[PDB]
Design a protein around this ligand. Structure first.
Ligand SMILES: CC(C)CN(C[C@@H](O)[C@H](Cc1ccccc1)NC(=O)O[C@H]1CO[C@H]2OCC[C@H]21)S(=O)(=O)c1ccc(N)cc1
Lengths: 99, 99
């Protein structure tokens, strides 16, 4: 796909058999999803964004399907205003910015 | 150009006599820059990210040069930890996401 930016780059992702909408977010280093349950061990962590720091649960080596492209990587779960796919996963689907 | 996402997509922007480093950020609706004293009328605004909201000043029709490309639009100004080029300006340079 080529995705233009007149609207939010929202795509459907598959994670744990769940379908969610997420924002392709080149300004995010990391992928952060709203509160959900994922299996396996996790580490408590903190990350900062525009309005300060939040607490997240860090899940590693999680399979996600983004627009039919399969990635396996780190997913942070916590109180994000929207599901954001960060660069850790955008790189795995071969995503670039072009102009 | 094509910009990969292995690293933060930082680029040089010019606005007035000031050069700045800013993020090409598909996750940001509007452009937001750190402390600067722009001319003309502005409106107060609140924008939300991870961690909550910050107050900014909305300046409209501001000329900006991004990677040699002259552009013109809204620039928000406030205590962002990083300068962000938002979709409002990315569209004007014909920026797309591709994978
Ligand atoms: C939270 C997003 C939905 C929207 N934002 C842009 C977003 O790309 C920020 C942009 C950003 C970038 C750096 C610092 C603060 C904000 N990234 C971000 O929060 O990423 C976090 C997840 O990975 C980590 O890597 C960077 C911060 C962490 S935002 O900064 O809050 C924001 C919101 C509204 C506007 N107009 C402009 C920016």
């Amino acid at each position: 796909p080529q995705i233009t930016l007149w609207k939010r780059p929202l795509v459907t992702i598959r994670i744990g058999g769940q379908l969610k909408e997420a924002l392709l977010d080149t300004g995010a280093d990391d992928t952060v999803l709203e509160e959900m349950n994922l299996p396996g061990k996790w580490k408590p962590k903190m990350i900062g964004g525009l309005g300060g720091f939040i607490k997240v649960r860090q899940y590693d080596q999680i399979p996600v399907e983004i627009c039919g492209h399969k990635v396996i990587g780190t997913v942070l779960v916590g109180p994000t205003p929207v599901n954001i796919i960060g660069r850790n996963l955008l790189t795995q689907i071969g995503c670039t910015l072009n102009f």
